[PDB]
Amino acid sequence: FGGGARSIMFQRDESLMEFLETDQVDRLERLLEEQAEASVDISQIKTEQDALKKAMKAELQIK
């Protein structure tokens, strides 16, 4: 049970764009872009981690 996903409220319903200030809109856009960048970086690094896990000892755990 549970499941689902937390999501960016601001891309689901757009009435909130009329609530947020322009500076806050810029902050939101920066948040979205930087989280996309972090997402791709973390996906790459976690794929590397998974491949290393599939490779196989104490030194490996330290790494």
């Binding site: 049970f1 499941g3 689902g4 409220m9 609530f19 200030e21 902050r27 948040l31």
Partner: protein, 250 residues
């Protein structure tokens, strides 16, 4: 200071659907099934909880007021913190500040955040009878599973240790949600608009039987709030001017 339990039903005027990653399979959008593949579909409480949390946040910002420019005083951090409980800006010192934080921020107390337990708990809605679910969205279009029109869905929430202002905020959120009482996804195809009612019953601990404070009925033709106690809760939340929603922590 009371514990409120909402017990009632949701008659789905339209089919009700939800796209849960674990529930949806290669076959298509299948509702989560409450057990194995051959158990009864249930509408997850996560969807209703998100919808009512956003209703709460929207009523909070509306009561806060909008400037002449038409924007709310809150910043993006406070919006995210109220709605999704995420410490955007980013303990023993919060051990006793939690009560004050709840007092000044009814919403964050009602719906919790990381480390702060939410007073409101919104459960899973489950059909009463059987065969109240089918496949919709014909078109090559992958059909999605959903409930049926008129499906009676047994829903139950419980606010634990709700002050007058917490329950007032929750009832106000329900009032606002009754404007567009829509759950789940597929707003296109209008899948999600419902017609629900709940019996609000409190249970003073120690008592053998709870007492029904009244009824809240949501219909497309209006909202019926019966029982003076619910009106008192709403008026307590509305008339209060001692809320500071510009707060956070961890």
């Amino acid at each position: 200071m009371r514990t409120l339990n909402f017990n009632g039903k949701i008659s789905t005027l339209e089919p009700l659907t939800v796209t849960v990653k674990n529930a949806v399979s290669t076959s298509g959008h299948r509702l989560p099934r409450n057990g194995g593949f051959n158990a009864a579909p249930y509408f997850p409480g996560t969807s209703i909880r998100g919808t009512l949390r956003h209703a709460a946040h929207k009523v909070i910002v509306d009561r806060v007021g909008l400037n002449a420019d038409g924007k709310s005083p809150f910043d993006l951090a406070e919006h995210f913190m109220l709605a999704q409980g995420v410490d955007i800006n980013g303990a023993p010192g919060e051990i006793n500040a939690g009560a004050e934080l709840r007092s000044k921020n009814p919403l964050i107390s009602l719906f919790g955040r990381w480390g702060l337990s939410g007073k409101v708990g919104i459960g899973n809605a489950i059909p009463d009878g059987d065969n109240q679910w089918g496949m919709f969205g014909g078109g090559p279009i992958d059909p999605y599973e959903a409930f049926i029109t008129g499906a009676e869905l047994s829903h139950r929430m419980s606010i634990k240790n709700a002050t007058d202002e917490e329950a007032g905020l929750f009832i106000s959120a329900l009032i606002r949600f009754a404007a567009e009482p829509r759950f789940g996804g597929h707003a296109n195809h209008n899948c999600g608009l419902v017609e629900a009612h709940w019996t609000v019953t409190t249970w003073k601990p120690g008592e053998l039987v709870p007492v029904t404070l009244g009824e809240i009925v949501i219909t497309p033709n209006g909202v019926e709030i019966t029982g003076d106690e619910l009106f008192a809760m709403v008026k307590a939340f509305n008339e209060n001017q001692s809320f500071d929603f510009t707060a956070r922590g961890h």
